[PDB]
Protein backbone atom coordinates (compact mmCIF):
# COMPACT_ATOMS: atom_id res chain seq x y z
CA UNK A 1 0.00 0.00 0.00
CA UNK A 2 1.10 3.57 -0.74
CA UNK A 3 1.39 5.30 2.64
CA UNK A 4 3.76 7.57 4.58
CA UNK A 5 4.24 10.20 1.90
CA UNK A 6 7.39 12.31 1.88
CA UNK A 7 7.35 15.77 3.50
CA UNK A 8 8.37 17.32 0.17
CA UNK A 9 4.98 19.06 0.06
CA UNK A 10 6.04 21.03 3.15
CA UNK A 11 9.35 22.00 1.49
CA UNK A 12 8.22 23.36 -1.89
CA UNK A 13 5.59 25.60 -0.23
CA UNK A 14 6.50 28.20 2.40
CA UNK A 15 6.95 31.95 2.87
CA UNK A 16 10.61 32.41 3.88
CA UNK A 17 12.75 29.66 2.38
CA UNK A 18 16.46 30.25 3.07
CA UNK A 19 19.60 32.23 2.25
CA UNK A 20 22.58 31.09 0.20
CA UNK A 21 25.06 31.35 3.10
CA UNK A 22 22.73 29.37 5.41
CA UNK A 23 20.85 26.80 3.31
CA UNK A 24 18.73 23.96 4.65
CA UNK A 25 19.99 20.37 4.45
CA UNK A 26 16.79 18.42 5.01
CA UNK A 27 17.56 14.69 5.14
CA UNK A 28 14.43 12.95 3.83
CA UNK A 29 14.16 9.17 4.18
CA UNK A 30 11.70 6.35 4.91
CA UNK A 31 9.01 7.27 2.39
CA UNK A 32 7.78 6.43 -1.10
CA UNK A 33 9.19 9.36 -3.09
CA UNK A 34 6.58 9.94 -5.81
CA UNK A 35 8.54 12.22 -8.14
CA UNK A 36 5.59 12.20 -10.56
CA UNK A 37 3.77 14.45 -8.08
CA UNK A 38 6.84 16.71 -7.99
CA UNK A 39 6.32 17.36 -11.71
CA UNK A 40 2.78 18.75 -11.46
CA UNK A 41 3.71 21.08 -8.59
CA UNK A 42 3.74 24.92 -8.82
CA UNK A 43 4.88 26.07 -12.28
CA UNK A 44 8.60 25.39 -11.96
CA UNK A 45 10.94 26.90 -14.54
CA UNK A 46 13.81 24.38 -14.29
CA UNK A 47 13.79 20.60 -13.75
CA UNK A 48 17.21 19.66 -15.14
CA UNK A 49 18.19 16.34 -13.57
CA UNK A 50 21.83 15.59 -14.36
CA UNK A 51 22.26 12.07 -12.97
CA UNK A 52 19.30 10.01 -14.17
CA UNK A 53 15.90 10.49 -15.82
CA UNK A 54 12.81 11.34 -13.74
CA UNK A 55 10.92 8.47 -15.39
CA UNK A 56 13.54 5.95 -14.26
CA UNK A 57 13.97 7.76 -10.93
CA UNK A 58 10.71 6.28 -9.59
CA UNK A 59 12.14 2.74 -9.94
CA UNK A 60 15.42 3.18 -8.03
CA UNK A 61 15.79 2.92 -4.27
CA UNK A 62 17.90 5.39 -2.30
CA UNK A 63 19.24 5.75 1.23
CA UNK A 64 18.44 9.40 2.00
CA UNK A 65 17.83 12.48 -0.14
CA UNK A 66 19.42 15.79 0.88
CA UNK A 67 17.11 18.70 0.00
CA UNK A 68 19.02 22.00 -0.14
CA UNK A 69 17.02 25.17 -0.81
CA UNK A 70 18.10 28.77 -1.35
CA UNK A 71 17.18 31.96 -3.23
CA UNK A 72 19.30 33.48 -6.00
CA UNK A 73 18.78 35.96 -8.82
CA UNK A 74 17.67 35.03 -12.33
CA UNK A 75 21.10 35.44 -13.93
CA UNK A 76 22.63 33.18 -11.26
CA UNK A 77 20.62 29.97 -11.81
CA UNK A 78 23.15 29.09 -14.51
CA UNK A 79 25.85 28.94 -11.83
CA UNK A 80 24.07 26.07 -10.03
CA UNK A 81 25.51 23.31 -12.21
CA UNK A 82 27.90 20.35 -11.81
CA UNK A 83 31.02 22.45 -12.28
CA UNK A 84 30.93 26.20 -12.92
CA UNK A 85 32.37 29.38 -11.42
CA UNK A 86 30.63 32.52 -10.24
CA UNK A 87 29.93 34.83 -7.34
CA UNK A 88 27.44 32.27 -6.01
CA UNK A 89 28.92 29.06 -7.45
CA UNK A 90 32.29 29.13 -5.64
CA UNK A 91 31.37 31.30 -2.63
CA UNK A 92 27.98 30.07 -1.40
CA UNK A 93 27.11 26.66 -2.90
CA UNK A 94 29.12 24.38 -5.18
CA UNK A 95 28.03 21.09 -6.75
CA UNK A 96 30.58 18.38 -7.62
CA UNK A 97 30.83 16.68 -10.99
CA UNK A 98 28.80 13.71 -9.78
CA UNK A 99 25.37 15.22 -8.99
CA UNK A 100 22.76 12.48 -9.45
CA UNK A 101 19.81 14.70 -8.49
CA UNK A 102 18.01 17.67 -10.00
CA UNK A 103 18.34 21.46 -9.96
CA UNK A 104 14.63 22.24 -9.49
CA UNK A 105 14.07 26.00 -9.44
CA UNK A 106 11.24 28.47 -9.97
CA UNK A 107 10.60 32.20 -9.95
CA UNK A 108 9.12 33.54 -6.72
CA UNK A 109 8.51 37.21 -7.55
CA UNK A 110 5.12 37.19 -5.84
CA UNK A 111 6.00 36.83 -2.15
CA UNK A 112 9.76 37.53 -1.87
CA UNK A 113 9.63 41.13 -3.14
CA UNK A 114 7.85 43.94 -1.28
CA UNK A 115 8.44 47.68 -1.69
CA UNK A 116 9.82 48.42 1.75
CA UNK A 117 13.55 47.68 1.45
CA UNK A 118 14.52 44.02 1.10
CA UNK A 119 17.60 43.86 3.32
CA UNK A 120 16.97 40.25 4.30
CA UNK A 121 19.25 38.03 2.20
CA UNK A 122 22.98 38.11 1.39
CA UNK A 123 25.43 36.28 -0.84
CA UNK A 124 28.92 36.60 0.76
CA UNK A 125 30.63 38.74 -1.86
CA UNK A 126 33.97 38.37 -0.02
CA UNK A 127 35.85 35.16 0.74
CA UNK A 128 39.35 33.71 1.06
CA UNK A 129 39.08 30.62 -1.15
CA UNK A 130 36.57 28.50 -3.04
CA UNK A 131 34.19 26.52 -0.86
CA UNK A 132 34.45 22.75 -0.71
CA UNK A 133 31.79 20.86 -2.73
CA UNK A 134 28.64 20.88 -0.57
CA UNK A 135 30.01 23.16 2.14
CA UNK A 136 28.24 25.85 4.17
CA UNK A 137 30.05 28.79 5.79
CA UNK A 138 27.75 30.26 8.46
CA UNK A 139 30.10 32.97 9.71
CA UNK A 140 29.90 36.69 10.41
CA UNK A 141 33.49 37.69 11.26
CA UNK A 142 34.71 40.84 9.53
CA UNK A 143 36.72 39.96 6.43
CA UNK A 144 40.41 40.82 6.87
CA UNK A 145 42.23 41.94 3.72
CA UNK A 146 45.60 40.81 5.09
CA UNK A 147 48.65 42.77 6.25
CA UNK A 148 46.74 44.16 9.25
CA UNK A 149 44.97 42.66 12.29
CA UNK A 150 41.25 43.39 12.71
CA UNK A 151 39.61 42.90 16.11
CA UNK A 152 36.49 44.24 14.39
CA UNK A 153 36.47 47.48 12.41
CA UNK A 154 35.09 48.75 9.09
CA UNK A 155 37.43 51.03 7.19
CA UNK A 156 40.10 50.89 4.48
CA UNK A 157 41.31 47.44 5.59
CA UNK A 158 38.39 45.25 6.72
CA UNK A 159 34.84 45.14 5.37
CA UNK A 160 31.59 43.26 5.86
CA UNK A 161 32.06 40.00 3.89
CA UNK A 162 28.30 39.91 3.17
CA UNK A 163 26.09 42.03 0.93
CA UNK A 164 22.30 42.03 0.72
CA UNK A 165 20.25 41.72 -2.46
CA UNK A 166 17.99 44.41 -3.95
CA UNK A 167 14.92 42.40 -4.93
CA UNK A 168 12.13 44.76 -5.97
CA UNK A 169 8.77 44.00 -7.63
CA UNK A 170 9.08 46.70 -10.30
CA UNK A 171 12.08 44.99 -11.92
CA UNK A 172 12.62 42.59 -14.81
CA UNK A 173 13.30 38.86 -14.91
CA UNK A 174 16.94 38.15 -14.14
CA UNK A 175 16.93 40.42 -11.09
CA UNK A 176 13.93 38.68 -9.49
CA UNK A 177 13.90 36.21 -6.58
CA UNK A 178 14.32 32.64 -7.84
CA UNK A 179 13.96 29.79 -5.35
CA UNK A 180 16.31 26.92 -6.21
CA UNK A 181 16.09 23.53 -4.49
CA UNK A 182 18.53 20.71 -5.26
CA UNK A 183 18.05 17.07 -4.26
CA UNK A 184 21.36 15.30 -3.64
CA UNK A 185 21.14 11.50 -3.82
CA UNK A 186 23.47 9.02 -2.14
CA UNK A 187 23.83 5.28 -1.53
CA UNK A 188 26.14 4.23 1.31
CA UNK A 189 26.48 0.79 2.95
CA UNK A 190 23.06 1.21 4.57
CA UNK A 191 19.64 -0.25 3.73
CA UNK A 192 17.83 1.90 1.19
CA UNK A 193 14.63 3.44 2.56
CA UNK A 194 13.27 5.81 -0.10
CA UNK A 195 12.35 3.74 -3.18
CA UNK A 196 9.16 5.09 -4.73
CA UNK A 197 5.62 3.97 -5.57
CA UNK A 198 5.43 0.36 -6.72
Amino acid at each position, epitope marked *: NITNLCPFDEVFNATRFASVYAWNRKRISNCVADYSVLYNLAPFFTFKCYGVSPTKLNDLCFTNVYADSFVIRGDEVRQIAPGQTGNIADYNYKLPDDFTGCVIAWNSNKLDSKVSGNYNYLYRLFR*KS*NLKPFERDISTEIYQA*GNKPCNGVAGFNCYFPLRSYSFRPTYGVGHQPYRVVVLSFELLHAPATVCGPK
Partner: single-chain antibody
Amino acid sequence: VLTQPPSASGSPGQSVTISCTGTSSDFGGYNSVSWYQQHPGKAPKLMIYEVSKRPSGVPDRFSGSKSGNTASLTVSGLQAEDEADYYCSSYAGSNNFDVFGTGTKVTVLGGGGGSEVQLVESGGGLIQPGGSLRLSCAASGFTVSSNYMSWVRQAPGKGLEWVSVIYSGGSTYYADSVKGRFTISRDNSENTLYLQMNSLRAEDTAVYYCARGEIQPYYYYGMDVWGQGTTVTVSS
Protein backbone atom coordinates in the same frame (compact mmCIF):
# COMPACT_ATOMS: atom_id res chain seq x y z
CA VAL B 1 27.38 49.09 -25.46
CA LEU B 2 25.90 52.24 -23.91
CA THR B 3 24.88 55.63 -25.31
CA GLN B 4 26.64 58.81 -24.19
CA PRO B 5 26.86 62.27 -25.76
CA PRO B 6 30.13 62.73 -27.68
CA SER B 7 30.75 66.15 -26.11
CA ALA B 8 29.15 68.66 -23.74
CA SER B 9 30.31 72.29 -23.85
CA GLY B 10 27.25 74.51 -24.32
CA SER B 11 26.25 76.49 -21.22
CA PRO B 12 29.33 75.54 -19.15
CA GLY B 13 28.49 74.60 -15.58
CA GLN B 14 24.84 75.63 -15.84
CA SER B 15 22.94 73.01 -17.87
CA VAL B 16 25.56 70.42 -18.84
CA THR B 17 24.24 67.58 -16.62
CA ILE B 18 25.67 64.77 -18.75
CA SER B 19 23.94 61.40 -18.54
CA CYS B 20 24.40 57.92 -19.99
CA THR B 21 20.94 57.35 -21.43
CA GLY B 22 20.01 53.80 -22.41
CA THR B 23 20.33 50.77 -20.13
CA SER B 24 17.36 48.71 -21.38
CA SER B 25 16.08 48.78 -17.78
CA ASP B 26 15.83 50.91 -14.63
CA PHE B 27 19.59 51.59 -14.87
CA GLY B 28 20.80 48.14 -13.91
CA GLY B 29 19.82 45.88 -11.05
CA TYR B 30 22.53 46.57 -8.48
CA ASN B 31 21.71 50.28 -8.90
CA SER B 32 25.42 51.16 -9.21
CA VAL B 33 26.30 53.78 -11.83
CA SER B 34 30.00 54.58 -12.08
CA TRP B 35 31.49 57.95 -13.01
CA TYR B 36 35.24 58.26 -13.59
CA GLN B 37 36.92 61.61 -14.32
CA GLN B 38 39.34 60.26 -16.93
CA HIS B 39 41.56 63.29 -17.33
CA PRO B 40 44.10 63.04 -20.17
CA GLY B 41 47.39 61.79 -18.80
CA LYS B 42 46.91 60.37 -15.31
CA ALA B 43 44.64 57.42 -14.59
CA PRO B 44 40.88 57.89 -14.05
CA LYS B 45 39.60 59.01 -10.65
CA LEU B 46 36.45 57.80 -8.92
CA MET B 47 33.69 60.41 -8.75
CA ILE B 48 30.33 58.63 -8.38
CA TYR B 49 29.71 54.93 -7.72
CA GLU B 50 26.15 54.73 -6.38
CA VAL B 51 23.33 56.99 -7.59
CA SER B 52 25.15 60.07 -6.34
CA LYS B 53 27.00 59.06 -3.13
CA ARG B 54 29.94 61.41 -3.64
CA PRO B 55 33.01 60.11 -1.75
CA SER B 56 35.65 62.20 0.02
CA GLY B 57 36.58 64.75 -2.64
CA VAL B 58 35.00 67.63 -4.55
CA PRO B 59 31.40 68.17 -3.33
CA ASP B 60 30.17 70.38 -6.21
CA ARG B 61 29.29 67.38 -8.43
CA PHE B 62 26.45 65.29 -7.00
CA SER B 63 22.74 64.48 -7.45
CA GLY B 64 23.16 61.67 -9.96
CA SER B 65 19.56 60.52 -9.67
CA LYS B 66 18.22 57.92 -12.11
CA SER B 67 15.71 60.14 -13.90
CA GLY B 68 13.48 57.61 -15.65
CA ASN B 69 15.82 55.33 -17.61
CA THR B 70 18.92 57.54 -17.33
CA ALA B 71 21.12 58.83 -14.51
CA SER B 72 21.37 62.61 -14.90
CA LEU B 73 24.55 63.46 -12.99
CA THR B 74 24.07 67.10 -11.96
CA VAL B 75 27.40 68.73 -12.84
CA SER B 76 26.12 72.33 -12.92
CA GLY B 77 27.75 74.80 -10.57
CA LEU B 78 30.96 72.77 -10.37
CA GLN B 79 33.54 74.99 -12.13
CA ALA B 80 34.54 76.53 -15.48
CA GLU B 81 38.13 75.28 -15.90
CA ASP B 82 38.40 71.62 -16.90
CA GLU B 83 39.72 69.61 -19.86
CA ALA B 84 38.89 65.93 -19.40
CA ASP B 85 36.67 63.10 -20.64
CA TYR B 86 34.16 61.54 -18.25
CA TYR B 87 32.99 57.93 -18.38
CA CYS B 88 29.95 55.98 -17.19
CA SER B 89 29.53 52.23 -16.69
CA SER B 90 26.36 50.72 -15.21
CA TYR B 91 25.37 47.05 -15.57
CA ALA B 92 24.84 43.90 -13.50
CA GLY B 93 25.05 41.23 -16.20
CA SER B 94 26.85 38.01 -15.31
CA ASN B 95 30.15 37.99 -17.24
CA ASN B 96 29.30 40.89 -19.55
CA PHE B 97 32.27 43.13 -20.33
CA ASP B 98 32.53 46.38 -22.34
CA VAL B 99 30.38 48.07 -19.69
CA PHE B 100 32.08 51.46 -20.03
CA GLY B 101 30.64 54.27 -22.14
CA THR B 102 31.85 56.31 -25.07
CA GLY B 103 34.18 59.27 -24.67
CA THR B 104 32.14 62.16 -23.26
CA LYS B 105 33.92 65.50 -23.67
CA VAL B 106 32.60 67.45 -20.67
CA THR B 107 35.14 70.24 -21.09
CA VAL B 108 33.42 73.32 -19.68
CA LEU B 109 36.18 75.67 -20.87
CA GLY B 110 38.53 73.51 -22.95
CA GLY B 111 41.45 75.92 -23.12
CA GLY B 112 42.02 76.65 -19.44
CA GLY B 113 46.97 57.96 -5.38
CA GLY B 114 50.75 58.07 -5.12
CA SER B 115 51.28 57.40 -1.41
CA GLU B 116 47.88 55.75 -0.83
CA VAL B 117 48.91 52.15 -1.52
CA GLN B 118 51.35 51.92 -4.48
CA LEU B 119 51.57 52.42 -8.24
CA VAL B 120 53.97 50.40 -10.42
CA GLU B 121 53.79 48.80 -13.86
CA SER B 122 56.02 47.05 -16.41
CA GLY B 123 56.75 49.84 -18.89
CA GLY B 124 56.30 48.00 -22.17
CA GLY B 125 58.47 50.28 -24.28
CA LEU B 126 58.68 49.01 -27.88
CA ILE B 127 56.89 45.71 -27.29
CA GLN B 128 57.87 42.98 -29.72
CA PRO B 129 54.68 42.00 -31.60
CA GLY B 130 52.98 39.12 -29.84
CA GLY B 131 55.29 37.23 -27.53
CA SER B 132 54.36 37.09 -23.86
CA LEU B 133 54.89 40.20 -21.73
CA ARG B 134 54.11 40.26 -18.00
CA LEU B 135 52.82 43.44 -16.35
CA SER B 136 52.76 43.65 -12.55
CA CYS B 137 51.20 46.20 -10.19
CA ALA B 138 52.92 45.44 -6.87
CA ALA B 139 50.91 47.06 -4.08
CA SER B 140 52.68 47.63 -0.76
CA GLY B 141 49.36 48.43 0.93
CA PHE B 142 46.40 46.07 0.87
CA THR B 143 46.99 42.39 0.12
CA VAL B 144 47.18 41.70 -3.62
CA SER B 145 45.90 38.18 -2.90
CA SER B 146 42.70 38.97 -0.96
CA ASN B 147 40.92 41.85 -2.71
CA TYR B 148 39.41 41.67 -6.20
CA MET B 149 41.82 42.96 -8.86
CA SER B 150 40.97 44.04 -12.40
CA TRP B 151 42.64 45.11 -15.64
CA VAL B 152 41.21 47.75 -18.00
CA ARG B 153 42.85 48.96 -21.21
CA GLN B 154 42.24 52.02 -23.37
CA ALA B 155 43.55 52.79 -26.86
CA PRO B 156 44.26 56.16 -28.51
CA GLY B 157 40.84 57.56 -29.38
CA LYS B 158 38.79 54.61 -28.16
CA GLY B 159 37.26 54.56 -24.69
CA LEU B 160 37.86 52.32 -21.72
CA GLU B 161 36.65 48.72 -21.64
CA TRP B 162 36.84 45.82 -19.20
CA VAL B 163 39.68 43.47 -20.15
CA SER B 164 40.30 41.22 -17.16
CA VAL B 165 38.67 40.32 -13.84
CA ILE B 166 40.05 38.01 -11.15
CA TYR B 167 38.13 37.05 -8.01
CA SER B 168 39.55 36.15 -4.60
CA GLY B 169 40.94 32.65 -5.06
CA GLY B 170 39.08 30.60 -7.63
CA SER B 171 38.06 32.61 -10.69
CA THR B 172 39.99 33.72 -13.78
CA TYR B 173 37.24 35.23 -15.94
CA TYR B 174 38.55 36.73 -19.18
CA ALA B 175 36.93 39.27 -21.47
CA ASP B 176 35.32 38.62 -24.85
CA SER B 177 37.93 40.58 -26.82
CA VAL B 178 40.75 38.18 -25.95
CA LYS B 179 38.32 35.21 -25.83
CA GLY B 180 41.02 33.02 -24.28
CA ARG B 181 44.34 34.14 -25.76
CA PHE B 182 44.99 36.04 -22.51
CA THR B 183 46.04 33.97 -19.48
CA ILE B 184 45.65 35.78 -16.16
CA SER B 185 47.92 34.42 -13.43
CA ARG B 186 48.25 35.79 -9.91
CA ASP B 187 51.86 36.41 -8.90
CA ASN B 188 53.44 35.54 -5.54
CA SER B 189 50.83 35.40 -2.79
CA GLU B 190 52.59 38.14 -0.78
CA ASN B 191 54.30 40.24 -3.48
CA THR B 192 52.09 41.29 -6.41
CA LEU B 193 49.74 40.16 -9.19
CA TYR B 194 50.93 40.26 -12.81
CA LEU B 195 49.40 39.60 -16.23
CA GLN B 196 50.43 37.82 -19.43
CA MET B 197 50.19 38.84 -23.09
CA ASN B 198 50.46 35.44 -24.84
CA SER B 199 50.83 36.37 -28.51
CA LEU B 200 48.58 39.41 -28.93
CA ARG B 201 46.63 39.95 -32.17
CA ALA B 202 47.81 43.56 -32.74
CA GLU B 203 44.79 44.88 -30.79
CA ASP B 204 46.55 44.89 -27.39
CA THR B 205 48.50 48.05 -28.27
CA ALA B 206 46.20 49.91 -25.86
CA VAL B 207 47.58 51.15 -22.54
CA TYR B 208 46.80 49.02 -19.49
CA TYR B 209 45.55 49.94 -16.02
CA CYS B 210 45.62 47.56 -13.04
CA ALA B 211 42.65 48.56 -10.89
CA ARG B 212 42.59 47.56 -7.23
CA GLY B 213 38.86 46.80 -7.33
CA GLU B 214 35.98 45.71 -9.51
CA ILE B 215 34.28 48.27 -11.74
CA GLN B 216 30.78 47.10 -12.69
CA PRO B 217 29.76 45.34 -9.43
CA TYR B 218 31.40 48.16 -7.54
CA TYR B 219 32.38 48.21 -3.88
CA TYR B 220 33.64 51.31 -2.08
CA TYR B 221 36.78 49.52 -0.80
CA GLY B 222 37.62 52.59 1.31
CA MET B 223 39.50 54.32 -1.51
CA ASP B 224 39.74 53.95 -5.28
CA VAL B 225 43.39 53.92 -6.39
CA TRP B 226 44.67 53.22 -9.91
CA GLY B 227 48.11 52.99 -11.48
CA GLN B 228 49.74 54.91 -14.30
CA GLY B 229 49.79 52.74 -17.41
CA THR B 230 52.34 52.01 -20.12
CA THR B 231 52.17 52.32 -23.90
CA VAL B 232 52.52 48.89 -25.51
CA THR B 233 53.52 50.20 -28.97
CA VAL B 234 53.32 46.93 -30.88
CA SER B 235 55.72 46.49 -33.80
CA SER B 236 53.76 44.17 -36.10
